[PDB]
Write a protein that binds this ligand. Structure first.
Ligand SMILES: *[C@@H]1O[C@H](CO)[C@@H](O[C@@H]2O[C@H](CO)[C@@H](O[C@@H]3O[C@H](CO[C@H]4O[C@H](CO[C@H]5O[C@H](CO)[C@@H](O)[C@H](O)[C@@H]5O)[C@@H](O)[C@H](O[C@H]5O[C@H](CO)[C@@H](O)[C@H](O)[C@@H]5O)[C@@H]4O)[C@@H](O)[C@H](O[C@H]4O[C@H](CO)[C@@H](O)[C@H](O)[C@@H]4O[C@H]4O[C@H](CO)[C@@H](O)[C@H](O)[C@@H]4O)[C@@H]3O)[C@H](O)[C@H]2NC(C)=O)[C@H](O)[C@H]1NC(C)=O
Ligand SMILES: *[C@@H]1O[C@H](CO)[C@@H](O[C@@H]2O[C@H](CO)[C@@H](O[C@@H]3O[C@H](CO)[C@@H](O)[C@H](O)[C@@H]3O)[C@H](O)[C@H]2NC(C)=O)[C@H](O)[C@H]1NC(C)=O
Ligand SMILES: *[C@@H]1O[C@H](CO)[C@@H](O[C@@H]2O[C@H](CO)[C@@H](O[C@@H]3O[C@H](CO)[C@@H](O)[C@H](O)[C@@H]3O)[C@H](O)[C@H]2NC(C)=O)[C@H](O)[C@H]1NC(C)=O
Ligand SMILES: *[C@@H]1O[C@H](CO)[C@@H](O[C@@H]2O[C@H](CO)[C@@H](O[C@@H]3O[C@H](CO)[C@@H](O)[C@H](O)[C@@H]3O)[C@H](O)[C@H]2NC(C)=O)[C@H](O)[C@H]1NC(C)=O
Ligand SMILES: Nc1nc(=O)c2c([nH]1)NCC(CNc1ccc(C(=O)N[C@@H](CCC(=O)O)C(=O)O)cc1)=N2
Ligand SMILES: *[C@@H]1O[C@H](CO)[C@@H](O[C@@H]2O[C@H](CO)[C@@H](O)[C@H](O)[C@H]2NC(C)=O)[C@H](O)[C@H]1NC(C)=O
Ligand SMILES: *[C@@H]1O[C@H](CO)[C@@H](O[C@@H]2O[C@H](CO)[C@@H](O)[C@H](O)[C@H]2NC(C)=O)[C@H](O)[C@H]1NC(C)=O
Ligand SMILES: *[C@@H]1O[C@H](CO)[C@@H](O)[C@H](O)[C@H]1NC(C)=O
Ligand SMILES: *[C@@H]1O[C@H](CO)[C@@H](O)[C@H](O)[C@H]1NC(C)=O
Lengths: 218, 213, 334
């Protein structure tokens, strides 16, 4: 019932600069200056980790670059100097009223120089072809920024159906993103075309970054 | 060290019940709060309930009243949550954390994955992806439920690995995994994809061999 | 059962500091029945300008009773902090035949603020709160004072402008400092004058809300409200129980200036009340606005023979506890 609205939904910061996330409670969390407001960090595939409790007290072992402030309805989490491992989700969370509620979260991304994707295309394996299907897989690895668009072409014509895309979260060391795209056909339709092409548009180049194979050519 | 060890993931049909456990170590159980929380992929966390281990006193999110019951066994420092009348909306990761009331949750379990579905368990098909560095791949297709675990060369090859989040289409998951290795390393030496699917009690090792033409 | 409002939504209880020694004062106010202290008026028939012998429930002459005091809570300047109370919640007493209560006797005179014994202030009347029931025991951490099953709670509210009486199950809550939670010392009620007691806006549920922070109210058979006119006049309050239920007595309606007690409510409580305790209350004021609150005195009732002297107006203005000594026995025989 007590609602916490975080700002902003996401933000990108360079190494060493300040990140500022704010949380606003619908009603007052403070009790004459002491506010049961907590902050958490969550990295992918991991449980949350406590950063700050009671608005401004640091959790045990939490680096000093994470700091919390605020009272009443308004709180903020400051990260400075930001480090590359700080790419994560950050949640505020109040412990004053039942039910305990979290904010919807802020995604913090690290800014780095631009990096063009490394693109690899793979024809269907013979193992899969013996089972009657045929998946073509494109990997687009270690690029920045995250915005990328991938089109599949089959004999020059675009193909949208049968496409499954997956994105990693920002890497905690090199600050890049990766993407995987799988185009699945039946075996019969696969052998009725020759040219299979994975095309990526990304800010690191004017022309799309293609990758192709011909079913005949190995 | 402080440890919250949660029980293994479960797949259950709608209407069934599950009992999750959380075996704790390394701190005084009898004087701490234990909370249980729910998190769907891509979403924030939802607090379900807490229990004060010293008294057995509980506080529930009224959204979950009638479906969740938290208990403790103080002799083994273990917290439990019984979930009943499960719906597909109950599919999520469930955490136990030490904390509750005004105490911030400072230690967390690793999470227990609960899938509520009528779909049948399906083992993955594992397909090798073969084409200076060279990128190799592993396509893990057509399995249910999550998770599968993917390693390369029994975990000894971990740098340059990108394992991508599974994508669900028509009640079957597909994921892929790429590994990039120096070209002097493959195919002169072995690169193998190791795929475990615990829900179907399946482990697949797929050696990546160069294509024949 | 009755709807008594929402449960508290607070994640925890207010921390409670128990310092009995600040509340152990000798402010003696013993029963003097020659001034009709502690007399419940005989029920069923009135008397006028006559002296009679009567068997009923009376306090004994010279009884000191038990004294109870409420105090301002901890505060640092403009910030209230822990509550500050005596150990009353752990001191469960036997109900027996009931009791009468002297309320507000010291009001208008100069007194101490308790928490700050050197700070003095004009004493103001405060109403007592009671917990009564037929089954008691201990909280999980071993502290005494837990009432099981249906429990009668008499709880003033609205900055002394109403009295609440309810009969519910008291489910101890589990948050920090709550009776089934971490670091429980004592339950208590409180109110915050700055936000609860400005003019024209008395919070009629401040005390109840603070009670609901320690206990969930469950399966409540009734919750009655009685409005109180605000003044500094001393009054007497009484409570007995018969097969017809629990009877509440007051001097306020019929004998406001003379103190005779008359029944104003009968509560549908038919389990035998065997135990009671005094619910501590702490006033969450800032330092510079602490008040002194008058002590209240409780005296047990017992079946005794009294000579009762009724004035022409119909009121008892003098009595004699006949069993006090041999001379009092013969006085009662005129
Ligand atoms: C501060 O402290 C005070 C305590 O000192 C707290 O006071 C408590 O406040 C709560 C509100 O939060 C009150 O709860 C409400 O109680 C009323 C009581 O109303 C009486 O009349 C009801 C309707 O009356 C007519 O219609 C019925 C037929 O339906 C007739 O029989 C009557 O004769 C009238 O003609 C009546 O239904 C009620 O009966 C209750 O008691 C009997 C005997 O125990 C039971 O059989 C009943 O089941 C019931 O318990 C009562 O006598 C209720 O009406 C309220 O319920 C309505 O609102 C709810 C809110 O959603 C809803 O869930 C209910 O279903 C119900 O809604 C329906 O009825 C409405 C009214 O007719 C319609 O408008 C509506 O559209 C819908 O159809 C609610 O339970 C407590 O009574 C009150 N306690 C005391 C002692 O005063 C206060 O909360 C504190 N403040 C804070 C901020 O904490
Ligand atoms: C209240 O009750 C009292 C009795 O407890 C009444 O008081 C007294 O009643 C006696 C009855 O004998 C009155 O005695 C009378 O005295 C006069 C004057 O000497 C005499 O002429 C009569 O023959 C009779 O003896 C007496 O007046 C009366 N008062 C006192 C002080 O003794 C009383 O009347 C009742 N009513 C009241 C007080 O309003
Ligand atoms: C809660 O606080 C009260 C207030 O101090 C404690 O009450 C006191 O307890 C002592 C010991 O039981 C009493 O002493 C006894 O007095 C009688 C005479 O009245 C004497 O005969 C006994 O031998 C004994 O000395 C003391 O009178 C009493 N005071 C009052 C005002 O009740 C109580 O013990 C505390 N309880 C808890 C659980 O903390
Ligand atoms: C604290 O001080 C207040 C203010 O003086 C006291 O209130 C006053 O109490 C007296 C005696 O109870 C009241 O006098 C009575 O007035 C009625 C009015 O008709 C009269 O019939 C009686 O014979 C008697 O003279 C007075 O009205 C009252 N004043 C107010 C404003 O309420 C109060 O008693 C004091 N409290 C203590 C504990 O001493
Ligand atoms: N907050 C507060 N509430 C009070 O009720 C209160 C207070 N502060 N401060 C002082 C005080 C004083 N109350 C009382 C009660 C009775 C006697 C009394 O009976 N006097 C004694 C005199 C004792 C002596 O000096 O020998 C007597 O019995 O004669 C005195 C003060 N009462
Ligand atoms: C009266 O209250 C007692 C104490 O709260 C109740 O006894 C408890 O009941 C619960 C519910 O099954 C048990 O889990 C506890 O172990 C019981 N405690 C004891 C000491 O027996 C009792 O049920 C209540 N009686 C009625 C008639 O409501
Ligand atoms: C409050 O009263 C309700 C009944 O109105 C109690 O709920 C019942 O409990 C019994 C067990 O004694 C169950 O068999 C029933 O199914 C419950 N419902 C009804 C409608 O009877 C409840 O236990 C009481 N609360 C407490 C704390 O005693
Ligand atoms: C409650 O505690 C008191 C004091 O510790 C003890 O004397 C009493 O026996 C206890 N009551 C029960 C029912 O255990
Ligand atoms: C009690 O007093 C309040 C405050 O003025 C009033 O609204 C309410 O109607 C009164 N109730 C009774 C029964 O007199």
């Amino acid at each position: 019932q007590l609602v916490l609205t975080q700002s902003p939904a996401s933000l990108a910061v360079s190494l060493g600069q300040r990140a500022t996330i704010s949380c606003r409670a619908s009603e007052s969390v403070d009790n004459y200056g002491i506010s049961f407001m907590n902050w958490f960090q969550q990295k992918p595939g991991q449980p949350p980790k406590l950063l700050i409790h009671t608005a401004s007290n640091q959790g045990s072992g939490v680096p000093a670059r994470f700091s919390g402030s605020g009272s009443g309805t308004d709180f903020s989490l400051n990260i400075h100097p930001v480090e590359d491992d700080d790419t994560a989700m950050y949640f505020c969370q109040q412990s004053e009223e039942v039910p305990l509620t979290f904010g919807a979260g802020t995604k913090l991304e690290i800014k780095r120089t631009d990096a063009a994707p490394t693109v690899s295309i793979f024809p269907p394996s013979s193992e899969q072809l013996t089972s009657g299907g045929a998946s073509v897989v494109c990997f687009l690895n270690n690029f920045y920024p995250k915005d990328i668009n991938v089109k599949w072409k089959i004999d020059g014509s675009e193909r949208q159906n049968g496409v499954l895309n997956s994105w990693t979260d920002q890497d905690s060391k090199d600050s890049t993103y990766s993407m995987s795209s799988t185009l699945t056909l039946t075996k019969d339709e696969y052998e009725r075309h020759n040219s299979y092409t994975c095309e990526a548009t990304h800010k690191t180049s004017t022309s799309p970054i293609v990758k192709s194979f011909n079913r005949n050519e190995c | 060290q402080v440890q919250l060890q949660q029980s293994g993931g479960e797949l259950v049909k709608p209407g069934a019940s599950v009992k999750l456990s959380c075996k704790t170590s390394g701190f005084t159980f009898s004087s701490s709060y234990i909370s249980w929380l729910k998190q769907k992929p891509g979403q924030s966390l939802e607090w379900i309930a807490w229990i004060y281990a010293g008294t057995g006193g509980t506080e529930y999110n009224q959204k979950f009243t009638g479906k969740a019951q938290v208990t403790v066994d103080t002799s083994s420092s273990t917290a439990y949550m019984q979930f009943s009348s499960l719906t597909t909306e109950d599919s999520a990761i469930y955490y136990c954390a030490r904390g509750g009331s005004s105490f911030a949750m400072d230690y967390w379990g690793q999470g227990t994955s609960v899938t509520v579905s009528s779909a049948s368990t399906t083992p993955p098909s594992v397909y090798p992806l073969a084409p200076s560095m060279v990128t190799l791949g592993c396509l893990v297709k057509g399995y249910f439920p999550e998770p599968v675990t993917v390693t390369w060369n029994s975990g000894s090859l971990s740098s340059g690995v990108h394992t991508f989040p599974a994508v669900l289409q028509s009640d079957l998951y597909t994921l892929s995994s790429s590994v990039t290795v120096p070209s002097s390393t493959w195919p002169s030496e072995t690169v193998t994809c190791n795929v475990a699917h615990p829900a179907s009690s399946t482990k697949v090792d797929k050696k990546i061999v160069p294509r024949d033409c | 059962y009755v709807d008594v409002g929402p449960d508290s939504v607070k994640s925890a209880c207010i921390e409670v500091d128990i310092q009995q020694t600040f509340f152990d004062k000798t402010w003696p106010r013993p029963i003097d029945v020659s001034k009709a202290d502690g007399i419940i008026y005989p029920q069923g028939r009135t008397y006028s300008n006559i002296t009679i012998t009567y068997q009923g429930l009376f306090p004994y002459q010279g009884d000191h009773g038990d004294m109870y005091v409420y105090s301002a809570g901890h505060a640092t300047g403009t910030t209230p902090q822990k509550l500050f109370v005596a150990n009353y919640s752990q001191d469960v007493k036997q109900f027996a035949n009931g009791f009468v209560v002297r309320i507000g006797a010291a009001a208008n005179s100069t007194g101490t603020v308790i928490i700050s014994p050197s700070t003095s202030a004009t004493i103001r009347k405060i109403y007592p709160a009671f917990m009564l029931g037929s089954s008691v025991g201990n909280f999980s951490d071993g502290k005494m004072g837990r009432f099981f099953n249906h429990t009668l709670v008499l709880l003033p509210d609205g900055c002394g402008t109403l009295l609440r009486a309810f009969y519910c199950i008291l489910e101890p809550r589990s948050g920090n400092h709550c009776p089934a939670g971490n670091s429980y010392t004592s339950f208590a009620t409180y109110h915050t004058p700055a936000t609860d007691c400005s003019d024209g806006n008395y919070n009629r549920n401040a005390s109840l809300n603070s009670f609901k922070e320690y206990f969930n109210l469950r399966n409540c058979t009734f919750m009655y409200t009685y409005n109180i006119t605000e003044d500094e006049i001393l009054e007497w309050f009484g409570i007995t129980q018969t097969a017809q239920g629990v009877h509440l007595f007051s001097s306020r309606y019929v004998d406001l200036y003379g103190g005779n007690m008359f029944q104003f409510a009968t509560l549908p409580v038919y389990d035998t009340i065997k135990y009671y305790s005094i619910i501590p209350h702490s006033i969450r004021s800032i330092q510079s606005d602490r008040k002194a609150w008058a002590a209240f005195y409780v005296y047990k009732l017992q079946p005794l023979t009294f000579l009762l002297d009724f004035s022409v107006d119909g009121y008892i203005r003098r009595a004699i506890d006949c069993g006090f000594n041999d001379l009092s026995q013969l006085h009662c025989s005129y």
